[PDB]
Amino acid sequence: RATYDFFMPQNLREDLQKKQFATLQVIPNSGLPQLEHWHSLVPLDTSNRKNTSCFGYPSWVYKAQNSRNGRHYALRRLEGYRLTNEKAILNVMKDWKKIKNASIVTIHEVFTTREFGDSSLIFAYDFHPLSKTLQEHHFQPIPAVPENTIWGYICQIANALKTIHSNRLAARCLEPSKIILTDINRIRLSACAILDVVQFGMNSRSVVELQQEDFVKFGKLILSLATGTLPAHLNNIPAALETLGNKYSANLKSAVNWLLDTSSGETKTIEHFMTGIASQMTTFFDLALQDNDEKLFHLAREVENGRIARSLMKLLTILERGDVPSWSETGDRYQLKLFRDYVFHRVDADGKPNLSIGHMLTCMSKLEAGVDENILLTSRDNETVFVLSYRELRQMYDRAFNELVKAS
Amino acid sequence: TYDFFMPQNLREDLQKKQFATLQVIPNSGLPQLEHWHSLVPLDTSNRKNTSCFGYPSWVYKAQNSRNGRHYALRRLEGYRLTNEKAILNVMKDWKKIKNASIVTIHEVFTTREFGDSSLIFAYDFHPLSKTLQEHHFQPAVPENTIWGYICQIANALKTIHSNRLAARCLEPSKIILTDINRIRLSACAILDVVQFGMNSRSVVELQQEDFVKFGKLILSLATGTLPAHLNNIPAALETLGNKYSANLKSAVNWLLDTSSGETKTIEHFMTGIASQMTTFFDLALQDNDEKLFHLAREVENGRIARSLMKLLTILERDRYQLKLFRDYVFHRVDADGKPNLSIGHMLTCMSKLEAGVDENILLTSRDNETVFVLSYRELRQMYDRAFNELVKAS
Ligand SMILES: Nc1ncnc2c1ncn2[C@@H]1O[C@H](COP(=O)(O)OP(=O)(O)OP(=O)(O)O)[C@@H](O)[C@H]1O
Ligand SMILES: Nc1ncnc2c1ncn2[C@@H]1O[C@H](COP(=O)(O)OP(=O)(O)OP(=O)(O)O)[C@@H](O)[C@H]1O
Ligand SMILES: [Mg+2]
Ligand SMILES: [Mg+2]
């Protein structure tokens, strides 16, 4: 079913570059204000549709830079929220600051502000650059969602619900617009604890009851992805379940049916639900580790590039210096010169220059490691040649450099 | 805890693993194979033990000749190949297998270059790996670590059993820690080849023992006794029950039990640890984020490296001005004549060069008579023109 590269970006380097670029963007002179601890606000909303569907208030999301640690965060703003009870913020925030989960966007702070020209309620989240909602990704008007992708989503939401429910809390909001893809097939709940504050007090439903609602909302989320119609527009659930049954396996239809069902005399628990998707959970555990290996591979390659870069800088500092006289032309530095030629002045038998990057990187790594491998250094007149090991070259190399450190 | 799969010092860890990968021993008695060279022994202790495969087993780090990559070679000493059909068939079945908790096998071949008839299995190479035996048997194992191992072994068994195969070998000496709390089965398909003509038991029967061997592995870690020396399973089960929760004791008992009259399947076992599997799904992903964080910080190192290498290849076959620029950046000298080695200046100048900034610098020849006022934009132009001239020649 699923591919090994399930959690793997196609081009990790560009992806990181684009995300870094998106993280640093600022608007020099915007009408947006500066908060006591936040500045350089940048809107992330593609469309400023004054919509109140999710929280009963219009909501904006800003990328902002914190003043204390200088890191970037996502600020969720509820326009027009008037603080009547400070306890709503303190109690909800006290419960959610504990939560740390790979499938939930962390909340750090909740506060009210007047800097926007009104009474606004601000929620400060982790920032995930170039994130798009499941709504934006799958429902935006122009294809069918692969079943393995849905199972991936199910396992990640299940992961979130395990942590949330175990802490005597509920994921009040499971709408597609409030679940973001922070990377390929990687989803996180983007709006936790907001409904906890908005519905504080006036709510009468208990925790367990709210948790029962999480499963229904969970089931409607899957149904939306399978049918392509948003949850709020699902008029005929039986008709949707039957659409799902024709496109997907019986296993998926059974899971969604268990999530939607409220007529059984048994209370639904995340414990029971996980037991039923154990096989899928193991598969995406595997895929996560394989992607970990992929990231470790690239990370190891770039850390070594860092080491090589510092070696190349030292090399450039040593050779052809200005100024003992002819210091770079005599003794050890002369061999270092021929080594440079061997690595960076490679030429084919025909006489054409060879610019293979691989030969160059391999040689510099062997130099740092001081490998007991021999190479043939050829003089520029080439009448004379020298056989040296990388271990020996490293010795000359370190000795030539620390002479300059002596001179300070 | 959240940092379950996260090394304490990733920097030091990667450096050591890099050194271990490139290391060679100049003159050992070890031979050169048709497609392998620079063999390096990985056996920590050279005690000749034949318990696992009935033959002494050696592991070498070797460099492939076709591709320049490093691999782990498992050598079975004194094994003479009797059936040619056995090797190919076991291979085509395991060549498919790709799993995060199993060391990939690539090739199987016989050799006489070692001074005897040896059977060689070529694996992926995981530098500075240690076995569970070396790690745990050479304090009490936290229960969280054991569930971690169980999920990874369970993961491995799902893929193996689904391919109508069995993990013949689950001993602690053939399960390696390739990183913190990260285990992989190091010896798959070896017993498949050795016992090909002799084994009469079916696939399903072999799979039932895997669960027993799995259960014996866990009991060993909880009690501190090697599987081969577990004389009293009931007493060990009671020890485990006194040190650990009832959940673990239940899992181990299910793995060991063969009296239930019910065929054990990996499907059923996975169902019973569904919650544990979810926790470690989370932990793998949080480590995913951790590695991505460091990678983002390190990603520019490649570009910086190529800029310096580019500079080194153009010079010493417009070139004159580039020479003063190199001098300006890497040959700074104090008023006394002493060399200045500030790293910040070097990085800044190469960064401005790459960016082609319109900022001007004053280049002076060592003879004070000639000077050049140039911008980094102009220097980048020459820098690029000088290079693509060499690409032309190639
Ligand atoms: N933590 C975050 N980091 C980065 N981007 C985020 C984060 N949370 C949300 N976003 C992005 O901000 C944008 C706006 O999100 P929002 O929830 O407002 O969606 P919306 O389409 O405006 O829905 P609504 O109509 O309910 O406001 C989305 O593209 C989303 O991916
Ligand atoms: N695929 C691999 N990549 C890297 N290192 C490995 C690999 N497989 C095994 N090793 C390492 O090689 C060493 C040899 O262990 P091996 O199990 O072959 O013998 P042993 O445990 O020393 O003794 P015995 O042969 O009695 O088991 C171990 O330290 C192990 O971590
Ligand atoms: Mg919005
Ligand atoms: Mg050995």
Coordinates of C-alpha atoms in Angstrom, one line a residue, chain B residues 115-315:
Chain B
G115 CA 41.9 -18.9 3.9
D116 CA 38.8 -21.1 4.4
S117 CA 35.4 -21.7 2.9
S118 CA 33.3 -18.8 4.1
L119 CA 29.8 -17.6 3.5
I120 CA 29.4 -13.8 3.2
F121 CA 26.2 -11.7 3.7
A122 CA 26.4 -8.0 2.7
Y123 CA 24.3 -5.6 4.8
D124 CA 23.8 -1.9 5.1
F125 CA 26.4 -0.4 7.4
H126 CA 25.5 1.4 10.6
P127 CA 28.7 2.9 12.2
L128 CA 29.4 2.4 15.9
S129 CA 26.5 0.0 16.3
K130 CA 26.4 -2.2 19.4
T131 CA 24.3 -5.3 20.1
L132 CA 21.7 -5.5 22.9
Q133 CA 23.9 -8.2 24.4
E134 CA 27.0 -6.0 24.6
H135 CA 24.9 -3.0 25.7
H136 CA 22.7 -4.6 28.4
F137 CA 24.6 -7.7 29.7
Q138 CA 28.2 -6.5 29.6
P139 CA 21.2 -1.3 35.9
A140 CA 17.6 -2.4 35.5
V141 CA 16.1 -1.7 32.1
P142 CA 13.3 0.9 32.3
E143 CA 9.9 -0.4 31.2
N144 CA 9.5 2.3 28.6
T145 CA 12.7 1.2 26.8
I146 CA 11.4 -2.4 26.6
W147 CA 8.1 -1.3 25.1
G148 CA 10.2 0.7 22.6
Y149 CA 12.1 -2.5 21.7
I150 CA 8.8 -4.5 21.4
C151 CA 7.2 -2.0 19.0
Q152 CA 10.3 -2.1 16.8
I153 CA 10.5 -5.8 16.8
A154 CA 6.8 -6.0 16.2
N155 CA 7.3 -3.7 13.3
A156 CA 10.0 -5.9 11.9
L157 CA 7.9 -9.1 12.3
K158 CA 4.9 -7.5 10.5
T159 CA 6.9 -7.0 7.3
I160 CA 8.7 -10.3 7.6
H161 CA 5.6 -12.4 8.3
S162 CA 3.6 -10.6 5.6
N163 CA 6.2 -11.8 3.1
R164 CA 5.7 -15.4 4.2
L165 CA 9.0 -15.5 6.0
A166 CA 10.2 -15.7 9.6
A167 CA 12.9 -14.0 11.6
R168 CA 14.9 -17.1 12.5
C169 CA 17.2 -15.2 14.8
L170 CA 16.1 -12.9 17.6
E171 CA 19.0 -13.3 20.0
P172 CA 20.3 -10.2 21.8
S173 CA 23.6 -10.5 20.0
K174 CA 21.9 -10.1 16.6
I175 CA 19.9 -7.1 17.5
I176 CA 21.9 -3.9 17.2
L177 CA 21.5 -0.4 18.6
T178 CA 22.2 1.8 15.5
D179 CA 21.3 4.8 17.6
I180 CA 19.7 5.6 21.0
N181 CA 16.8 3.3 21.7
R182 CA 16.8 2.4 18.0
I183 CA 17.2 -1.3 17.3
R184 CA 17.4 -3.3 14.0
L185 CA 17.6 -7.0 13.3
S186 CA 21.1 -7.5 12.0
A187 CA 21.0 -11.2 11.0
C188 CA 18.1 -11.9 8.7
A189 CA 18.1 -14.7 6.1
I190 CA 21.4 -16.2 7.4
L191 CA 19.6 -19.2 9.0
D192 CA 17.4 -19.3 5.9
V193 CA 20.4 -20.2 3.8
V194 CA 22.2 -22.4 6.4
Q195 CA 19.1 -24.5 7.2
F196 CA 17.6 -24.5 3.7
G197 CA 18.2 -28.1 2.9
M198 CA 17.9 -29.3 6.5
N199 CA 14.8 -27.5 7.8
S200 CA 11.5 -29.4 7.4
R201 CA 9.3 -27.1 9.5
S202 CA 6.8 -24.9 7.6
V203 CA 6.6 -21.2 7.5
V204 CA 3.9 -20.9 10.1
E205 CA 5.7 -23.1 12.5
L206 CA 8.9 -21.0 12.2
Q207 CA 6.7 -17.9 12.9
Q208 CA 5.4 -19.5 16.1
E209 CA 8.9 -19.8 17.4
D210 CA 9.7 -16.2 16.5
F211 CA 7.1 -15.2 19.1
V212 CA 8.7 -17.6 21.6
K213 CA 12.1 -16.2 20.8
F214 CA 10.7 -12.7 21.0
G215 CA 9.3 -13.6 24.4
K216 CA 12.6 -15.0 25.5
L217 CA 14.4 -11.8 24.4
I218 CA 12.2 -9.6 26.6
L219 CA 12.5 -11.9 29.6
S220 CA 16.3 -11.8 29.2
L221 CA 16.3 -7.9 29.4
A222 CA 14.0 -7.8 32.4
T223 CA 15.8 -10.4 34.4
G224 CA 19.4 -9.9 33.1
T225 CA 19.8 -13.5 32.0
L226 CA 20.9 -14.6 28.5
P227 CA 18.2 -16.5 26.6
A228 CA 20.4 -19.6 26.4
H229 CA 20.7 -19.6 30.2
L230 CA 17.0 -19.2 31.1
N231 CA 16.5 -22.5 33.0
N232 CA 13.4 -21.5 34.9
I233 CA 10.9 -19.6 32.7
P234 CA 8.3 -19.6 35.4
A235 CA 10.7 -18.1 38.0
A236 CA 11.8 -15.5 35.5
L237 CA 8.2 -14.6 34.7
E238 CA 7.6 -14.1 38.5
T239 CA 10.7 -11.9 38.7
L240 CA 9.4 -9.8 35.8
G241 CA 6.0 -9.6 37.4
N242 CA 7.6 -8.3 40.6
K243 CA 9.7 -5.6 38.9
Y244 CA 7.3 -4.6 36.2
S245 CA 3.6 -3.9 35.5
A246 CA 1.0 -6.5 34.7
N247 CA 0.7 -5.4 31.1
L248 CA 4.2 -6.4 30.3
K249 CA 3.9 -9.7 32.1
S250 CA 0.8 -10.4 30.0
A251 CA 2.5 -9.7 26.7
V252 CA 5.5 -11.8 27.5
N253 CA 3.3 -14.7 28.6
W254 CA 1.3 -14.5 25.4
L255 CA 4.5 -14.6 23.4
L256 CA 5.8 -17.6 25.4
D257 CA 2.6 -19.5 25.7
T258 CA 1.9 -22.3 23.2
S259 CA -0.8 -24.1 25.2
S260 CA -3.6 -21.7 24.3
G261 CA -4.3 -23.9 21.2
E262 CA -4.6 -20.7 19.2
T263 CA -2.2 -19.9 16.4
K264 CA -0.3 -16.7 17.3
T265 CA -0.3 -14.0 14.6
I266 CA 1.5 -10.6 14.5
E267 CA -1.9 -9.1 13.8
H268 CA -3.2 -10.2 17.2
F269 CA -0.1 -9.1 19.0
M270 CA -0.1 -5.7 17.4
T271 CA -3.7 -5.2 18.6
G272 CA -2.7 -5.8 22.2
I273 CA 0.0 -3.1 22.2
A274 CA -1.9 -0.6 20.1
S275 CA -1.5 2.2 22.7
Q276 CA 2.3 1.7 23.1
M277 CA 2.6 1.8 19.3
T278 CA 0.9 5.1 19.2
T279 CA 3.2 6.7 21.8
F280 CA 6.3 5.7 19.9
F281 CA 4.7 6.9 16.6
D282 CA 4.6 10.3 18.3
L283 CA 8.1 10.0 19.6
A284 CA 9.6 9.1 16.2
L285 CA 7.8 12.2 14.8
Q286 CA 9.1 14.5 17.5
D287 CA 12.6 13.3 16.7
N288 CA 11.8 13.9 13.1
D289 CA 11.1 17.5 14.0
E290 CA 14.3 17.6 16.0
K291 CA 16.5 16.4 13.1
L292 CA 14.7 18.8 10.8
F293 CA 15.5 21.7 13.1
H294 CA 19.3 21.0 13.0
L295 CA 19.2 20.3 9.3
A296 CA 17.7 23.8 8.7
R297 CA 20.6 25.3 10.6
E298 CA 23.2 23.3 8.8
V299 CA 21.8 23.4 5.2
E300 CA 23.9 26.4 4.1
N301 CA 27.2 24.6 4.8
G302 CA 27.0 22.8 1.4
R303 CA 26.7 26.2 -0.4
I304 CA 29.6 27.8 1.6
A305 CA 31.7 24.7 0.9
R306 CA 31.1 24.9 -2.9
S307 CA 32.0 28.6 -3.0
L308 CA 35.3 27.9 -1.3
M309 CA 36.0 24.9 -3.6
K310 CA 35.1 27.0 -6.6
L311 CA 37.5 29.7 -5.5
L312 CA 40.3 27.0 -5.1
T313 CA 39.8 25.5 -8.6
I314 CA 39.9 28.7 -10.6
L315 CA 43.1 30.1 -9.2

